[PDB]
Design a protein around this ligand. Structure first.
Ligand SMILES: *[C@@H]1O[C@H](CO)[C@@H](O[C@@H]2O[C@H](CO)[C@@H](O[C@@H]3O[C@H](CO[C@H]4O[C@H](CO)[C@@H](O)[C@H](O[C@H]5O[C@H](CO)[C@@H](O)[C@H](O)[C@@H]5O[C@H]5O[C@H](CO)[C@@H](O)[C@H](O)[C@@H]5O)[C@@H]4O)[C@@H](O)[C@H](O[C@H]4O[C@H](CO)[C@@H](O)[C@H](O)[C@@H]4O[C@H]4O[C@H](CO)[C@@H](O)[C@H](O)[C@@H]4O)[C@@H]3O)[C@H](O)[C@H]2NC(C)=O)[C@H](O)[C@H]1NC(C)=O
Ligand SMILES: O=C(Nc1ccccc1)c1cc(S(=O)(=O)N2CCCCC2)c(Cl)cc1Cl
Ligand SMILES: [Ca+2]
Ligand SMILES: [Cl-]
Ligand code: NA
Ligand code: NA
Ligand SMILES: [Zn+2]
Length: 805
C-alpha cells in the first residue's frame, strides 16, 4: 500500500528513493504503482512540446511548459535543448567541426568529467554504416571519438542479460540474469519482463556500476527509465541533474532507448520502417549534445554510445516444434524462442529422463535448425552453465529460427519479423560501441571487443576500483587517452623442477612396450643438448607459461617440443612446439604403432601405465606433441614417451588425429609457421575454472590417471605473416580452441563421414580466447615477448569467430 496523497512538489525525479507508504517521485514509481497523485502534472509536463521557436524567445517563464525559452532558463538549467540555437544564434553541436579534446574543459566545481552511458536496445553493428546517412549526430560521435567496428554481446543475446553484463562486467551465469525469463529452484520463484518480480533484489548478483560508484562516494543517476517516460524527458532530466550543486550532482548517468529493438521485432532488422526509428535516436543524441554544449559540458563529459545486442530476420514459419520429435511433449516445460531451455514439467515425475530427451532431439531431421546440449557440453566460450537457473538441457538454435514446444504455442500466443537471442558469435547479433570525450582517444578505431570489458573501463573513467569481474583489466587501455590502469603480470606460484636422467628402464613396470632397441660420437652430444634445452628458443617462443597455483611439476625438454609435466595429474599441463612453413608431415612407422616408452627423467610412481588403457575398454590414448610432425626419424622416439601421453576416447581420437595430422600443417602453411601450445583441461563442475584434484569425477579404469573434460590448443604466429612465426618482430596473431573430450561424436551430425567434412567445423564452434584457457588451467601465457603487457592482454581476450565480414 502507498498513501499516494503526498506531493512531488520540488521533488521531481529525486535521486534518493523514499520508504513507502510515503509516495515516490523517482523515475521508477510508475512501475511500482507508487507515484504521488501529482507526479504526471508536476514531473511529466508536456505543454508546448520540446523545442524553442522564434516567438518563444525571451518569453515570460511559464512553469507549465515542458521546457523553457525564457532568459533565466540557463541558470535554472531547464531550457529546451535548442534554446541557444533558436534564441542566441548558436550552432547545433552536429554542425561544428570536431576538435580534439586534449583535456577536460569543465565548469568550476567539477572534480571529474561526468560519464554518460547512452544505451540503445537492438542496435545492430552494421546500422553504423547502413544507416549513416540518417544519423548525423551518431556519425559525428563515431568518427570524432573512439569506435569499434562492432562489440560482441554475451550469450544469450537478450536485453536484460546484456544490460546487466554492461553494468557488472560479469557473465550472465555469474550475475544471475541468465535470460529474459527464468525459474530459480532454490527460491521456487519465476522471473519475467512483465511484472514486479524482476524488481526483487535477489535475482540480481554481482556489483553493478551504480553501487560501485555509491560505495566509493561517487553519486549516480538512475539506470532505469519507466517505459512511458518519453525520451525528450529523460534527456531533460539528465541535463537538469547536471545543473545540481557540486555536492548533489551525480557523476554517472544512463539513458536507455527501447528503439530500434521495438521496431526491429515488428519489421525485421532492415525493414523500410526501420529508417525512422534510427532518425529518432539520432535526434535524441542531437538533443543531448546540444544540451551539453549549452551547459558548456560538451568538451567535459565522456559519452558512451553502446548497444546491448543486434537483431536478425526471424519469422513464424521458421519454427521447429518439439512435438515433431518427442511423444512425451506434455511432461516438459520449454523456455522457447531463439534459444531453448528444457526442464521436467513436474519434479514428482521420476520417469522423466534428460538422456532420452537429448537422444530424441539429436540429428533427427536432415536440416534440423537447432542442436541439443547438456549445458556442460555447450562451447566453453559461451560461459553458460554455472547457475541453477540454467536448465540442464539447452538448445542452440540456428540463426533465423525459433524453437517452440507445440504449434498451438505460436498461433495461440504472423506477428514478428525480427528477433535476437542467438549464439553471441553470430554477425547479426553484434552491436556497437563509440566512446567520445576528454578521456577517450581522438579519431581512433579499435578492434572488436566484448562487452564484459566495459565495466572496468567505466570504473577507470570514474576513478573507481572495480569489483571482481570477468573483464581483463588493461585489455581496453588502447581506447583511452589517459586514466589507463597499469596492470602487472600475476606472480608464478610454483616453480618447476628440471629433472635429469634418474631412473633405469627396468625400474618401470607399466606394461608398455616399444620396438626401440635399435642402435655415435657426434649425435650423442647432440641429443644430450636437446634434452638440456638447446632447441628451447625454437619451441618456446613467448617464455614458459607460469603456473599460478601450488603444485608439483617438471619441465621436460626434447628436440621437437617442450612440456610442463604434472606429477599430480600424471600428464603435461602444457606442451609447446613450433611448426615452420617448411616442416614435413611423416607418419608413424609400423614398428612403432603401439609403442610407449618410459621417461627416465620421471619416476614410475609419477607416470601413466599402459595396462590401465588395456583394461579400460572405453578409454584409449593420444599424444600432445603429434608423432606425425617429428623433425627426424630419431626425434620421433621422443613423441612416444609416456610423459607425452594423455587419455582419449576413440571417438575423440578421430578429432585429435585430424587436427594434428592435417590441420597443424595447414595452418603453418597459411600463417608462415605456427607456435602450438596444447594440453588437457579438467572442468567437472563446469564453473570455467581449473579443477583441483579432489574435483575429478573420472579416472582411467583402475588407475589414478584423471580424464580431461576438454583439450585446448593455442596457435600463435606473426600478425605480419611475411615474417615466420619463430622470427617475428612485431604484433602476434592467435587463434585457440577448447574441444570437449567426448566419448561420442553425437554433436557432429556428419561424423560418420570423413573427418575433412566435420572436424574443422567442430573446432570452429569451440573457438576460445587464450583468457578462457587461463581460467581453466591456472596458467598464464605470453610471459616473455617483446610487446607491451596491455597489448598482450588484448591478444589474450581476442576470439577468432569464423564469421564473414
Ligand atoms: C567471473 O567473475 C566472477 C567474480 O570474480 C567469478 O565468480 C566468483 O568466483 C569465486 C570463486 O568461485 C566465488 O568465490 C566464492 O564465494 C563464496 C561467497 O559467495 C558470496 O559472496 C560473493 C562475493 O560478495 C557473492 O558475489 C556471491 O553471490 C553469488 O551467489 C548468489 C546466489 O546464492 C547470487 O546472487 C550471485 O549472483 C552469485 O552467484 C554466482 O556465484 C556462486 C558462487 O559463489 C554460484 O554458485 C552461482 O551459480 C552464481 O554463478 C555470494 O553471496 C564463498 O562461500 C566460496 O567459498 C567456498 O569455497 C572455497 C574455495 O576457496 C573454500 O575455501 C571456502 O571455505 C568455501 O567452501 C565452503 O563452502 C563450500 C560451498 O558451499 C563447501 O563445499 C565447502 O565444504 C566449504 O565449507 C567462494 O570463495 C565468488 O562468489 C564468485 N563471485 C560472483 C559474483 O559470482 C567467476 O569465477 C568468473 N568466471 C570466470 C570463468 O572466470
Ligand atoms: O542494468 C540495468 N540497466 C542498465 C541501463 C543502461 C546500461 C547498463 C545497465 C537495469 C537496472 C534495473 S534497476 O536499477 O531497476 N534494478 C537493478 C537491481 C535491483 C533491481 C532493480 C532493472 Cl529492473 C533492469 C536493468 Cl536491465
Ligand atoms: Ca572447475
Ligand atoms: Cl530467455
Ligand atoms: Na582401452
Ligand atoms: Na555424429
Ligand atoms: Zn528485443
Amino acid at each position: 500500500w502507498t498513501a499516494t496523497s503526498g506531493s512531488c512538489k520540488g521533488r521531481c525525479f529525486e535521486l534518493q528513493e523514499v520508504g513507502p507508504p510515503d509516495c515516490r517521485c523517482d523515475n521508477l514509481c510508475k512501475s511500482y504503482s507508487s507515484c504521488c497523485h501529482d507526479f504526471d502534472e508536476l514531473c511529466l509536463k508536456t505543454a508546448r512540446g520540446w523545442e524553442c521557436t522564434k516567438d518563444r524567445c525571451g518569453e515570460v517563464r511559464n512553469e507549465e511548459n515542458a521546457c523553457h525559452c525564457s532568459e533565466d532558463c540557463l541558470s535554472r538549467g531547464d531550457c529546451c535543448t535548442n534554446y541557444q540555437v533558436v534564441c542566441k544564434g548558436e550552432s547545433h553541436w552536429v554542425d561544428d567541426d570536431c576538435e580534439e579534446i586534449k583535456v577536460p574543459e569543465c565548469p568550476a566545481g567539477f572534480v571529474r568529467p561526468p560519464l554518460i552511458i547512452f544505451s540503445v536496445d537492438g542496435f545492430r553493428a552494421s546500422y553504423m554504416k547502413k544507416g549513416s546517412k540518417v544519423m548525423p549526430n551518431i556519425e559525428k560521435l563515431r568518427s570524432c571519438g573512439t569506435h569499434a567496428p562492432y562489440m560482441r554481446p554475451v550469450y544469450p543475446t537478450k536485453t536484460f542479460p546484456n544490460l546487466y553484463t554492461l553494468a557488472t562486467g560479469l557473465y550472465p551465469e555469474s550475475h544471475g540474469i541468465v535470460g529474459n525469463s527464468m525459474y530459480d529452484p532454490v527460491f521456487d520463484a519465476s522471473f519475467h519482463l512483465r511484472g514486479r518480480e524482476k524488481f526483487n533484489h535477489r535475482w540480481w548478483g554481482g556489483q553493478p556500476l551504480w553501487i560501485t560508484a555509491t560505495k566509493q562516494g561517487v553519486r549516480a543517476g538512475t539506470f532505469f527509465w519507466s517505459v512511458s517516460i518519453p525520451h525528450e524527458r529523460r534527456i531533460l532530466t539528465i541535463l537538469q541533474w547536471l545543473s545540481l550543486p557540486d555536492n548533489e550532482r551525480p557523476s554517472v548517468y544512463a539513458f536507455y532507448s527501447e528503439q530500434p529493438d521495438f521496431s526491429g521485432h515488428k519489421y525485421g532488422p532492415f525493414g523500410p520502417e526501420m529508417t525512422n526509428p534510427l532518425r529518432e535516436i539520432d535526434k535524441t543524441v542531437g538533443q543531448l549534445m546540444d544540451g551539453l554544449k549549452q551547459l558548456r559540458l560538451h568538451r567535459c563529459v565522456n559519452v558512451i554510445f553502446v548497444g546491448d545486442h543486434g537483431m536478425e530476420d526471424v519469422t513464424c514459419d521458421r519454427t521447429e516444434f518439439l512435438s515433431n520429435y518427442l511423444t512425451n511433449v506434455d511432461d516438459i516445460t520449454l523456455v522457447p524462442g531463439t534459444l531453448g531451455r528444457i526442464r521436467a514439467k513436474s519434479i514428482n515425475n521420476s520417469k522423466y529422463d534428460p538422456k532420452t530427451i537429448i537422444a530424441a532431439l539429436t540429428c533427427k531431421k536432415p536440416d534440423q535448425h537447432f542442436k541439443p546440449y547438456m549445458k556442460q557440453h555447450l562451447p566453453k566460450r559461451l560461459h553458460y552453465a554455472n547457475n541453477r537457473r540454467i536448465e540442464d538441457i539447452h538448445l542452440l538454435v540456428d540463426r533465423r529460427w525459433h524453437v517452440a514446444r507445440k504449434p498451438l504455442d505460436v498461433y495461440k500466443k504472423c506477428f514478428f519479423q525480427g528477433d535476437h537471442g542467438f549464439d553471441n558469435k553470430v554477425n547479426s547479433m553484434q552491436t556497437v560501441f563509440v566512446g567520445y570525450g576528454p578521456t577517450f582517444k581522438y579519431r581512433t578505431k579499435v578492434p572488436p571487443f566484448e562487452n564484459i570489458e566495459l565495466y572496468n573501463v567505466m570504473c577507470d573513467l570514474l576513478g573507481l576500483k572495480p569489483a571482481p569481474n570477468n573483464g581483463t583489466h588493461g585489455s581496453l587501455n588502447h581506447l583511452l587517452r589517459t586514466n589507463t590502469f597499469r596492470p602487472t603480470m600475476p606472480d608464478e606460484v610454483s616453480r618447476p623442477n628440471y629433472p635429469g636422467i634418474m631412473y633405469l628402464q627396468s625400474e618401470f613396470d607399466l606394461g608398455c612396450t616399444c620396438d626401440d632397441k635399435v642402435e655415435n660420437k657426434l649425435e650423442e652430444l647432440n641429443k644430450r643438448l636437446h634434452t638440456k634445452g638447446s632447441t628451447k628458443e625454437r619451441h618456446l617462443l613467448y617464455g614458459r607459461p607460469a603456473v599460478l597455483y601450488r603444485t608439483s611439476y617438471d619441465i621436460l625438454y626434447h628436440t621437437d617440443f617442450e612440456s610442463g609435466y604434472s606429477e599430480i595429474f600424471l600428464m603435461p599441463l602444457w606442451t609447446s612446439y613450433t611448426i615452420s612453413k617448411q616442416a614435413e608431415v611423416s607418419s608413424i612407422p609400423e614398428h612403432l604403432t603401439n609403442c610407449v616408452r618410459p621417461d627416465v627423467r620421471v619416476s614410475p610412481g609419477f607416470s601413466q601405465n599402459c595396462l590401465a588403457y588395456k583394461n579400460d575398454k572405453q578409454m584409449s590414448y593420444g599424444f600432445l606433441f603429434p608423432p606425425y610432425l617429428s623433425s627426424s626419424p630419431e626425434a620421433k622416439y621422443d613423441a612416444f614417451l609416456v610423459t607425452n601421453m594423455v587419455p582419449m576416447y576413440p571417438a575423440f581420437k578421430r578429432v585429435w588425429a585430424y587436427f594434428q595430422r592435417v590441420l597443424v600443417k595447414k595452418y603453418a602453411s597459411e600463417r608462415n609457421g605456427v607456435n602450438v601450445i596444447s594440453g588437457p583441461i579438467f572442468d567437472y563442475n563446469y564453473d570455467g575454472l581449473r579443477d583441483t584434484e579432489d574435483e575429478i569425477k573420472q579416472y582411467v579404469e583402475g588407475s589414478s590417471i584423471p580424464v580431461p573434460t576438454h583439450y585446448y590448443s593455442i596457435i600463435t604466429s606473426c600478425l605480419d605473416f611475411t615474417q615466420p612465426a619463430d622470427k617475428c618482430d612485431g604484433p602476434l596473431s592467435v587463434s585457440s580452441f577448447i574441444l570437449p573430450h567426448r566419448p561420442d561424436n553425437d554433436e557432429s551430425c556428419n561424423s560418420s563421414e570423413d573427418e575433412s567434412k566435420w572436424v574443422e567445423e567442430l573446432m570452429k564452434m569451440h573457438t576460445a580466447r587464450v583468457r578462457d584457457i587461463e581460467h581453466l588451467t591456472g596458467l598464464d601465457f605470453y610471459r616473455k615477448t617483446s610487446r607491451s603487457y596491455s597489448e598482450i592482454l588484448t591478444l589474450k581476450t581476442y576470439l577468432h569467430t569464423y564469421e564473414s565480414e
